Design a protein. Structure first.
Lengths: 485, 486, 486
């Protein structure tokens, strides 16, 4: 007697198929990554720029609360709190702010350089400050910026700088807006004042916009800041009859590509990732994850799913081809060295001897299937999270519509891929068994009796060397013509 | 004699598979929604704001043609005609108009408040209007705004403030008048170096009027430019002008849960309900796909270019991969009406149609799951779709179209192919169940019966209605029947 | 004897499936297009506007180096060098430049018309030029524009208008000059507090000069900033200036059906035809995917990040899920050449390869439908892909890239997995057809033959060449050959 059978174990693993729910399977693999390392990590060897709770404007201008900040020269992304507490301490706005943040998102190379030393505003006053930028407890000011009247005169302030630094240079400036016609005079004397900034491509003329304004940080005046990239060997010319907030410093900058600002309160921790999320770093081969939408790096596709389990083993029983959980009604706890095999009854003994030839063919296939699903995913470097001013709501909605669109596609396709491939994995196993049963049946023929539950009853004594011929497809029909029927 | 067979009927329902076109199928399910209710409905309990044929600008400003408008405090989307007839009755422009529309798209909560009553402009004339905005047939003006003009030969500095104590964020709109010529300026305002000044915590603006000759629109060379701000709670807005200020009298308390969209159509609201609205009518459906109209609002099926997505649910209709259906069992049974597969027995007693409950149920279960899988996995959140761009945003509008088109092509392709593939496997599924049923009987009989051809066994013994039972329910015993009439 | 076998040949063609790699197949089909004709062609009958190495700005303003450009009246897309050498010869900027380029991307119909003849500027000097816009080698200027300067010591108000009586929407460009200093302002315009004022029905703009020291670009410290508008049919445009106006002499009649793209390349129009153009050449194809170049214009296959998409059409080439091919019938027959599956017979007469035309045809039709389904379901509409952004639209640009990349990922994945899943099913399909051919004969011969193994039956009787054909064409009477050697 020799039976064909398949593996069963104590697994409680469940998968879903197109056709069935909660099907207990022999072995499985989750292709959805859900674990991170809880650390904020550096990205391919380069750390993030950590802004504490300063805004980028606060940092670049030199808000006094950003004094103890720690400026690395390289950085691969930026960490900023959702709502930083130290930004424009003197109230105001920053032209094209979001475009600026996007520029500084990742950097070569970034170095602050003194370009217009303050002591050389010889004909103007330099120490103007404000209680809004106070340093316990005297009036101070943005440390990287500087001009008010000298006596009762404010000559035309006019300086220029040639970018001899060998790199592209960020440069920021501002114009002040007083509270009312008077206040202006006590600050700049003249009235029809202007601020003029120009380069090879830049040219701009601002005039003070006076208005009555509530007090922010105790002030009613405002400062509006602008910025430019000054190309190498180009010069920038400042000219002002008043209200100019001048830079003392510029910033050498070089860039490879772009990255993103990650909103979080976590802090750099000394590890590596190819993929960062505001919750922690992801290290995975898997094509999908559900940790968090706002990742930076080379990441798996984010998916709304919270389970993507591929079946690798077979239906686990205590079928398209009618064998597994079919005409062979049960699995074997006993066979523990393969997925399909034989169970013999002999004068010598019995009887579990797994079929290595076919079990490998399946291990290979199911291996290759899992790898196809994984190895076909194209994962380039992306940032995801973006920034939009309060008058770019539509644009922000477009971006959201886009991110939601791709989320739905990947979720749907991953969910369906898993369901379909699972149905086909179970059917694969069923077919592997059915064919084993057929390979024996087509080998014995008259020499055995098909019992019904997966077994052949031999019409002759079949010792061990006999089985070792049927198990390996060498059984010879002619050698047996004992007819007990 | 017992025979294995499968169900057939008078269906003409057709599906396509990867391998075959135009296949007649026993039962089918269309997973593409194609019908709408032609009504314009309220969305999850909340109505649209209906603008008649006013524009948002005319509504907010208080164009007198928008008097009968009917304002609601809540609304879940906006209905606006493609080209409304009543907007800026006095010609002009609205700064960041589209951003402002986008804001008003979906609203909590919305309430007009009188923040700067006309009568307190005591040092200026307030009744100034224009023939451009005439009410049969005297000069009028936008009802929510105040056209400050001179009183006598004077226009003192106009200066007022409002602190937002209203408990909610407040939309406020103002305007500056650009006169056609120097006389219109003097007769209206007296002064000449005029300016308008508006400031809040975050807002800071100063505008000076531009006198210049312009073609006449609605009989006016002058133009009015309007701007808006959201005034945060407990903040204040300060207005100051030496002339040319079009002041608000009112502000709008606004709260927002989320956002929505404007629906461009001629239709009107109509006392029904949906979770999904299109400019042609509402959609009530379980289905994952529709082809009614791309510009929907709400929780909607995916819009696809396709116009037939039919899933096979039953089997090939025959009045395969496993070789049974339209195969070694050459045809189906019109007569077996209680299941998908079953037996036909010939007995000394009777004969003889009997559905196989067990395996038919396996199939009802599996095909149910399959349809439920295709439908239940579709992730349908709330979206607006339609969007607004100015004439200087062609590129951005084009980016949006390229994106909507991109998703359309993806969903269309995927759905069409999903249907083709899953159809192929459904047929083969049924085929497989018939082959297995056949084999479940053969392995039971063996010697006790002979295999005839198309799914029939001829018993080598008498088998009464009680024996047939043992076969149909798998409890047949070989031993009991050792009559070999072979 | 009677044997059931299958086609084999000298194919080195390889495919991949979900389950196996580098599987040698009988016949295959590549669905990824990789060839182009390396030419810049006309698009559906219509040429591209060819800018040589001028920029659109240079061209529209009339840079002297753009004189010999050849202006077709129609064009379906634009050809521009990645970085043109002839643009604003006199330094400056162009307001809303990308929007203008996107507008001119594709055109009906487009013709230049003289709207404001130079000599009618009677109170002004009209011939001012620059060394920056010089023609070997005297100072010249943008040929389509007029640099109004003073006559003697006077610059009276400059004031002209134009009614668009041309019958089409008209493009009009003007500029304002920003001098280097007060003294340069005075020698050109006399007056110091100047303005440029332009108005239509919907446009109203007032510009004032920003005099200021700048580095020299093309030897010039000054700049010119140009603006543009579309003047509607029968509308008028008012120009008014006290100095610094760069007036248009010409306007551009323009009409549009739709929109298109700019193709950045060095290549030049070469006189052919395409529905699909890339910067590397045109694509003539039926296939659903290509990997030539992402920036296409026209109706194009989906661009995929893949270099092989190979569908199996034939079978596993053997010198399975159903256990027949490379299973219990261990190898394929190089012999049988006129079919995919067939029979081999041992006889006393001939012997004997005969292909089953009936079974083979069912398969040819099915795989034909499969390939066609994959190809014919793909929707290809006209798009431009390449887009343009100023350097203060980095975010918008990155948004566009995020989107293009996203569809790129989706299509690649879906196509790669499509090919693999359908290959696993194509092989199994052949395997099923062979297994079914075998069973079709087995269920026909029953006791009259013995089941050997390699899919061969041993006849228990003389079966001459005519008996064979009763098996092959599935019409074989068992009644007849009731002879017993067992």
């Amino acid at each position: 007697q020799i039976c064909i059978g398949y593996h069963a174990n104590n697994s409680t693993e469940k998968v879903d198929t197109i056709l069935e729910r909660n099907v207990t399977v022999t072995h499985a693999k989750d292709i959805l990554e859900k674990t991170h390392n809880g650390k904020l990590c550096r990205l391919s060897g380069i750390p993030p720029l950590e802004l504490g709770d300063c805004s980028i404007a606060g940092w670049l201008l030199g808000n006094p609360e950003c004094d103890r900040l720690l400026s690395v020269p390289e950085w691969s992304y930026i960490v900023e709190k959702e709502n930083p507490t130290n930004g424009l301490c003197y109230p105001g706005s920053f032209n094209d702010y979001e475009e600026l943040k996007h520029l500084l998102t990742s950097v070569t190379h970034f170095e602050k350089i003194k370009i217009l030393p303050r002591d050389q505003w010889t004909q103007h006053t330099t120490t103007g400050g404000s209680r809004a930028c106070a340093v316990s407890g005297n009036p101070s000011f943005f440390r990287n910026m500087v001009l008010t009247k000298k006596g009762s005169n404010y000559p035309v302030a006019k300086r220029s700088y040639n970018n001899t630094s060998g790199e592209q240079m960020l440069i920021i400036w501002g114009i002040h807006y007083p509270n009312d016609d008077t206040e202006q005079r006590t600050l700049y004397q003249n009235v029809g004042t202007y601020v003029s900034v120009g380069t090879s491509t830049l040219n701009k003329r601002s005039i003070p916009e006076i208005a009555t304004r509530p007090k922010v940080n105790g002030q009613g005046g405002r400062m509006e800041f602008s910025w430019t990239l000054l190309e190498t060997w180009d010069v920038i010319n400042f000219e002002s009859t008043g209200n100019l907030i001048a830079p003392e410093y510029g910033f050498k900058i070089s860039k490879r590509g772009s990255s993103g600002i990650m909103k979080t309160e976590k802090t750099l921790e000394n590890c590596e990732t190819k993929c960062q999320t505001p919750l922690g770093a992801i290290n995975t081969t898997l094509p999908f994850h559900n940790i968090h939408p706002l990742t930076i790096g080379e990441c798996p596709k984010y998916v709304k799913s919270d389970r993507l389990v591929l079946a690798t083993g077979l239906r686990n029983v205590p079928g398209l081809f009618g064998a597994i959980a079919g005409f062979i009604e049960g699995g074997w706890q006993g066979m523990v060295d393969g997925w399909y095999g034989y169970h013999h009854s002999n004068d010598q003994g019995s009887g579990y001897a797994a079929d290595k030839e076919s079990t490998q063919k399946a291990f290979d296939g199911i291996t290759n299937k899992v790898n196809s699903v994984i190895a076909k995913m194209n994962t380039q470097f992306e940032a995801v999270g973006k920034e939009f001013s309060n008058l770019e709501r539509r644009l922000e909605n477009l971006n959201k519509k886009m991110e939601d669109g791709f989320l739905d596609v990947w979720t749907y396709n991953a969910e369906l891929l898993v369901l379909m491939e699972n149905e086909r994995t179970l059917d694969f196993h069923d077919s592997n068994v059915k064919n084993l049963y057929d390979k024996v049946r087509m080998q014995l023929r008259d020499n055995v009796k098909e019992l019904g539950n997966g077994c052949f009853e031999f019409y002759h004594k079949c010792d061990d060397e006999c089985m070792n011929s049927v198990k390996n497809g060498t059984y010879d029909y002619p050698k047996y013509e004992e007819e007990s029927k």
